[PDB]
Design a protein around this ligand. Sequence first.
Ligand SMILES: O=c1ccn([C@@H]2O[C@H](COP(=O)(O)OP(=O)(O)O[C@H]3O[C@H](CO)[C@@H](O)[C@H](O)[C@H]3F)[C@@H](O)[C@H]2O)c(=O)[nH]1
Ligand SMILES: *[C@@H]1O[C@H](CO)[C@@H](O)[C@H](O)[C@H]1NC(C)=O
Ligand SMILES: [Ca+2]
Length: 278
Amino acid sequence: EHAEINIFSVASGHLYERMLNIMMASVMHHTNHTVKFWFIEQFLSPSFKDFIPHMAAEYGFKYEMVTYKWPHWLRQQKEKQREIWGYKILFLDVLFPLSLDKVIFVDADQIVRTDMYDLVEHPLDGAPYGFAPMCDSRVEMEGYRFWKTGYWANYLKGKPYHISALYVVDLQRFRELAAGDRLRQQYHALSADPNSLANLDQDLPNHMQFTIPIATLPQEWLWCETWCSDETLKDARTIDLCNNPMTKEPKLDRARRQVPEWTKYDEEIAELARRVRE
Ligand SMILES: O=c1ccn([C@@H]2O[C@H](COP(=O)(O)OP(=O)(O)O[C@H]3O[C@H](CO)[C@@H](O)[C@H](O)[C@H]3F)[C@@H](O)[C@H]2O)c(=O)[nH]1
Ligand SMILES: *[C@@H]1O[C@H](CO)[C@@H](O)[C@H](O)[C@H]1NC(C)=O
Ligand SMILES: [Ca+2]
């Protein structure tokens, strides 16, 4: 038909591609529903693209590569990080076929511990997309919660500041509302100021949430140690390995320390790689 769960992600770098395979394995280990992964093709390495049919056949999922060219009229991003962020949030209406009703962005560095079909079924109450809020539970990190003071605290008027690591998009609704055209136009005007949209993929939906509604997802949908308490980890449906501005601990060290099953997925994918080589 089109798959019960449709997930898209973006990865640039061998480290993020290594975590992307782990994310996919974690999704498949926690669901019996049909899954299809969608990749932002141009950022991937030839090795990753060659290995994906092996992952698909081992884990039992479908996949599709999407190559969408940045429109010439639309203000470009010279920083590759920001261009990749642009691909997460600016083209939700054109990356996928009109037959696809819903897609979920899951970060390449995520670890899933839930049946992702529960996010497909989560009620959005008319919102074109749903994001989890940033945690307030780790009190020692309050000084780094930039959204709780200054510009964002005044702008939000008590509304949540949502993390862009995970989000469900009701593509039927998002198209119904022309949210794509509206997000591109707002981004084009806002980005004329190079100081605006510092966290492009995160700031844009948070900025537009008064006119393009966000269904604030349950806090358990996204857990990051930087913002979220140790006590809420047991409830976490998905983990994001977000940067800790206080410790600056490396990415792989965060993965191994925080997530016990991380090495299990990593070793399982490396075992599959050696099996394919024979
Ligand atoms: O595929 C990739 C991704 C990153 N990097 C680079 O890794 C660095 C760290 O960024 P990363 O995306 O991992 O941060 P993270 O804290 O998970 O992001 C959150 O915050 C981000 C917004 O600030 C949000 O997009 C994200 O979902 C949140 F988890 C940074 O220099 C990126 O350019 C890369 O080389 N390749
Ligand atoms: C898939 O179905 C089997 C049926 O025996 C069940 O035991 C298993 O726990 C299910 N897995 C998931 C992730 O739902
Ligand atoms: Ca991340």
